[PDB]
Design a protein around this ligand. Structure first.
Ligand SMILES: [Mg+2]
Lengths: 313, 43, 232, 111, 56, 132, 49, 27, 96
């Protein structure tokens, strides 16, 4: 601590939305807080009104579980990737797929967009990640490297443009133009499933079953180790307010002070009306543009929305 | 007392499990039927 | 499969082939510690000292945490006679701040030669790396064993000074008492026993009892007033 | 490069389910350090899935609870996939769109 | 009695249950049925309003 | 024609076959026997030969329970039989007994692919090795 | 020097224990961690493109 | 010991209500 | 060593990139926006909308259908494939 640091208000569960038939694996939010999107084992992509929570639109077209979803900022596109092998670009102008990026050898676990260049980055079970030219559907680069499935990939503008982690427990930092690794971090003992980049600080964090590490940029000096909540943890996500959220396979969610590793709140959430206790835990979660709502994707086939409590102190 | 297998509850009400403060809504179907554009073009 | 193949070529004394097999196996799985041990072992069996030396260095560089590599590496150098080399290795090893046992082995290494000053120096670093009462006690005991009683006393003073009133207990204070007891400073022992006890937490209860017992023993080494006070 | 397809879909889904469980749990469960029951945990997976197909309650006398909650989770997922597929196919046949020799018999067995 | 096999005939809309019995119990039951209906018709058990009727 | 009385030979061979192949494969077990079918083998296992079946006299509790239940659900033997832990035919016989008594060169020429070991702070020049 | 052996001097490789050990703090911010700048990014982006 | 895994040797590769009494005795 | 082989799929298509426009929701607007206010007011509006929205002298039996008001079984969503109400309906429909 510094001095019993940064008092943040607790969050409460605000709303529960049903209406997937499979596990919801992925949530993304549109650039204007208008609509947020979900990928599912159902094989659909659904778009939901952020405000009312009503379902706007169901897309169909993936053959298998949709694993990853991104809404572009500078172009009216979704990108999605699946267990199928296929990464698709939907033109939201017509709600149809206009391009498909072909070439991974197995399931694609993850994807992300460069914020200024117009290039798409994807992770696959086949141990590679790819840099795809959005415009020409072309494998600009293939990032060989890890020995297992690559799980989560993040993309950034500055130095180490591509931050990625895999089930082989090691993080590599990829120099985009070379398509080679600058830094290998090996400090997690078990699979790295999630990483997240801090909006302002120029730092990044990684999560493993065992614990969560922050990193300096570049070159990933070690900084801190947040220890607390031990599960296979699938999600790390961060507000500009310094609120770091950790999801987990056992259902648990913890909120953290980015600076200190003060874990202010622990949320264990009820599973859905039917369901089973074991089908608990959050596959993924996100923050609307206003930082006022936390959305979670859960194995109980729901979407939960959390709202920061106004009486708090 | 007796409940036919016609009804017979399994699982508590959706609302009850979460608690009152949160709103639980089941979206099925959808609205804004697809010919609508998410992101509407300029003219 | 890799290993059996390597072994067969080794047996035919085609050790250049064997080397390539081991390297190929390492390419597949560099973390596997049996593989590395078999590789280094093979070199040593064929008297290929410098190959083995290279290999050991690689093993500790890439898998520093594996203590088996370090123990074997120092052993090999010792057998070869290269005390300096072994010392160097141990100094590298200690940078990883390893485990109580590793530090003990380093100290013992030094103590197979006279090198008492070296040993003491190692202990000085060790008791701060792993600042456990027990380690401090051990350090003091080391001095006692080699008759540096002046220094042993000083070590005890340092230990109690360092730990402070905040946290210290039974074991260390008992050990210090025993030391002074053996030094034939009975009055001093009582002073220490009383003053340091009152200065700190006392009663935890078990520890206190132990301390009391020790005190009683010391005293032994009209006068059953607390027999009545404890009962009453 | 090969493209998912109707011939390959069932095989595909089970392939990437075996992989899903394998990566997740062996990167999740561990400390066996040698090899932890990968063949075995997967055999428990197929065993459980058969048991749910036969509607036989499946309880292993000894077992770690994270392993059990694991299997019950993924098995329920595959059950949801299989069942939803069954409903959908019966809708297609009902409307009389699909003429296939296999999907009719299979879909029958499912119902 | 022994276990009856079951299978579904597929009408492409609603499935139809189909049962399979060992032959012995099928002959037994069959005679039981012809007999029951015969006595029943003789004794005027079923009033006329039940009409999957033999007459028409 | 296939039907008939059960034989000690057929019954013991049924024991061994069930032991080897397992409970769920009946057609394989019927294949070994003569004059018997798969259905008959299965029902012959679960009805009688199955070791989990209890063959002995009925205690007083089992008679109380059997009579009570049989008065509860008349004529339903396959529902009652699991509740008392006995075979349906057996508890039937015992019930009628209670009422009855009641009244090519990439290998061998040239070293396939060669990695000469890397060379490190020591002298490997001198070393060579002996023949076999 | 063992590990580098294959590579050029330029290319980095971690090996000493010191590398592993943690470094603390760095304050709310310092010039030490920051995103090259607008202008560096523009240069990099253009050359890359 | 805890992570001993029972071998998955493959096999492929009840209570009653008292209302029945009240009913039956009623009839 | 790059092969002269081709494929149908690979050929040019959609060579132009649709940049977002100003009314579609260009990043310029987004940066300037106060989302939180917008999100609150929309929410409030939604809430308001919701609020606005809302003889036989002889027989065996006296009325069974007294308080039987359907029940929320179709409002419950159940994360269990065999006990979902959808599954029940499906099972009801297709088996005899
Ligand atoms: Mg074919």
């Amino acid at each position: 601590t510094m001095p019993k640091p940064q008092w943040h208000p607790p969050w409460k569960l605000y709303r529960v939305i049903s209406g997937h038939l499979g596990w919801v694996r992925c949530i993304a939010v549109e650039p204007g807080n208008q609509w947020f999107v979900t990928g599912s084992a159902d094989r659909t992509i659904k778009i939901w009104d952020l405000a009312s929570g009503k379902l706007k639109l169901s897309l169909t077209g993936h053959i298998s579980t949709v694993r990853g979803v991104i809404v572009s900022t500078r172009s009216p596109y979704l990108f999605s990737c699946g267990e199928d092998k296929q990464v698709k670009c939907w033109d939201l102008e017509y709600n149809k797929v206009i391009r498909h990026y072909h070439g991974h050898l197995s399931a694609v676990y993850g994807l992300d967009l460069h914020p200024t260049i117009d290039v798409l980055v994807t992770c696959s079970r086949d141990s590679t990640a790819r840099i795809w030219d959005v415009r020409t559907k072309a494998s600009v680069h293939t990032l060989s490297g890890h020995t297992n499935a690559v799980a989560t990939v993040r993309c950034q503008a500055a130095e180490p443009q591509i931050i990625t982690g895999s089930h082989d427990t090691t993080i590599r930092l990829w120099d985009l133009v070379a398509g080679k690794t600058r830094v290998t971090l090996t400090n997690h003992k078990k699979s790295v499933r999630a990483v997240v980049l801090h909006p302002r600080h120029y730092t990044f964090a990684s999560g493993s079953p065992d614990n969560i590490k922050q990193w300096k940029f570049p070159d990933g000096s070690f900084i801190q180790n947040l220890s607390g909540h031990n599960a296979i943890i699938n999600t790390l996500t961060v507000n500009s307010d310094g609120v770091l959220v950790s999801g987990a396979d056992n259902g648990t969610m913890h909120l953290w002070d980015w600076r200190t590793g003060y874990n202010f709140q622990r949320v264990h959430a009820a599973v859905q009306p039917g369901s089973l206790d074991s089908e608990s835990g959050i596959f993924a979660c996100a923050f609307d543009q206003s930082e006022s709502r936390l959305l979670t994707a859960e194995a109980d086939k729901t979407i939960k929305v959390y709202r920061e409590d106004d009486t708090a102190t | 007392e007796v409940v036919l297998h016609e009804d017979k509850k399994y699982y508590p009400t959706a609302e009850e499990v979460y608690g009152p403060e949160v709103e639980t809504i089941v979206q099925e179907e959808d609205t804004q039927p697809l010919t609508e554009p998410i992101i509407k073009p300029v003219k | 499969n890799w290993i059996k193949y390597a072994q067969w070529e080794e047996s035919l004394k085609e050790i250049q082939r064997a080397r390539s097999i081991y390297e190929r196996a390492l390419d597949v799985d560099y973390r596997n510690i049996t593989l590395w041990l078999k590789y280094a072992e093979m070199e040593m069996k064929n008297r290929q000292v410098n190959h083995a030396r290279n290999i050991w260095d690689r093993a500790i560089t890439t898998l520093p945490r594996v203590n088996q590599f370090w123990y074997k590496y120092t052993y090999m150098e010792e057998m070869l006679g290269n005390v300096a080399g072994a010392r160097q290795v141990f100094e590298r090893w200690m940078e990883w701040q390893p485990e109580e046992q590793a530090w003990h082995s380093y100290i013992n290494f030094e103590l197979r030669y006279k090198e008492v000053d070296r040993a003491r120096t190692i202990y000085e670093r060790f008791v701060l790396v792993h600042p456990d009462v027990k380690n401090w006690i051990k350090y003091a005991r080391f001095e006692e064993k080699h008759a540096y009683f002046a220094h042993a006393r000083k070590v005890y003073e340092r230990a109690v000074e360092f730990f402070g009133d905040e946290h210290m207990d039974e074991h260390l204070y008992v050990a210090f008492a025993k030391f002074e007891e053996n030094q034939k400073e009975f009055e001093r022992v009582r002073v220490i026993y009383k003053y340091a006890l009152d200065r700190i937490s006392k009663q935890e209860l078990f520890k206190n009892y132990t301390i009391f017992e020790k005190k009683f023993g010391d005293r032994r080494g009209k006068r059953r007033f607390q027999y009545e006070e404890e009962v009453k | 490069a090969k493209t998912v397809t109707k011939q390959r879909v069932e095989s595909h889904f089970d392939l990437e389910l075996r992989a899903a469980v394998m990566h997740d749990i062996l990167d999740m469960m561990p400390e066996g350090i040698k090899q932890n029951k990968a063949r075995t945990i997967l055999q428990h997976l197929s065993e459980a899935w058969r048991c749910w197909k036969a509607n036989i309650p499946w309880k292993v006398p000894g077992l770690p609870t994270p392993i059990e909650n694991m299997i019950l989770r993924y098995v329920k997922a595959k059950a949801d996939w299989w069942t939803n597929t069954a409903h959908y196919n019966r809708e297609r046949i009902r409307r009389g769109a699909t003429v296939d020799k296999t999907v009719c018999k299979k879909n029958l067995g499912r119902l | 009695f022994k276990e009856v096999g079951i299978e579904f005939m597929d009408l492409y809309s609603h499935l139809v249950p189909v049962y399979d019995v060992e032959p012995l119990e099928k002959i037994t039951d069959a005679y039981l049925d012809q007999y029951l209906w015969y006595e029943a018709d003789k004794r005027r058990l079923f009033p006329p309003w039940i009409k999957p009727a033999d007459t028409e | 024609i296939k039907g008939g009385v059960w034989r000690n030979t057929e019954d013991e061979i049924l024991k061994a076959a069930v032991m080897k192949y397992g409970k769920n494969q009946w057609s394989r077990i019927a294949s070994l026997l003569h004059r018997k079918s798969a259905k008959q083998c299965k029902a012959r296992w679960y009805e009688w030969l199955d070791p989990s079946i209890k063959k002995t006299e009925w205690s007083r509790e089992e008679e109380e329970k059997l009579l009570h239940l049989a008065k509860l659900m008349p004529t339903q033997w396959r529902t009652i039989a699991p509740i008392i832990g006995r075979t349906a035919a057996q508890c039937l016989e015992h019930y009628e007994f209670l009422l009855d008594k009641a009244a090519g060169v990439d290998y061998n020429a040239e070293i396939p692919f060669e990695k000469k070991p890397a060379l490190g702070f020591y002298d490997t020049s001198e070393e060579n090795y002996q023949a076999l | 020097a063992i590990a580098r052996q294959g590579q050029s001097k330029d290319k980095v490789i971690y090996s000493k224990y010191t590398d592993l050990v943690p470094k603390e703090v760095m304050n709310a911010d310092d010039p030490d961690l920051q995103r090259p700048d607008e202008e560096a990014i523009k240069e990099i982006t253009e050359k890359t493109r | 010991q805890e992570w001993k895994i029972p071998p998955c040797i493959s096999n492929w590769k009840v209570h009653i209500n008292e209302n029945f009494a009240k009913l039956a005795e009623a009839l | 060593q790059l092969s002269k082989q081709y494929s149908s799929r690979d050929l040019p298509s959609h060579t132009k990139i649709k940049y977002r426009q100003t009314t579609q929701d260009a990043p310029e607007e987004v940066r300037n926006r106060d989302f939180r206010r917008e999100l609150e007011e929309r929410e409030r509006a939604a809430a308001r909308e919701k609020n606005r929205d809302r003889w036989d002298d002889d027989v065996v039996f006296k009325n069974c259908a007294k308080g039987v008001d359907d029940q929320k079984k179709d409002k419950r969503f159940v994360n269990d494939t065999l006990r979902s109400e959808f599954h029940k309906k499906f099972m009801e429909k297709y088996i005899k």
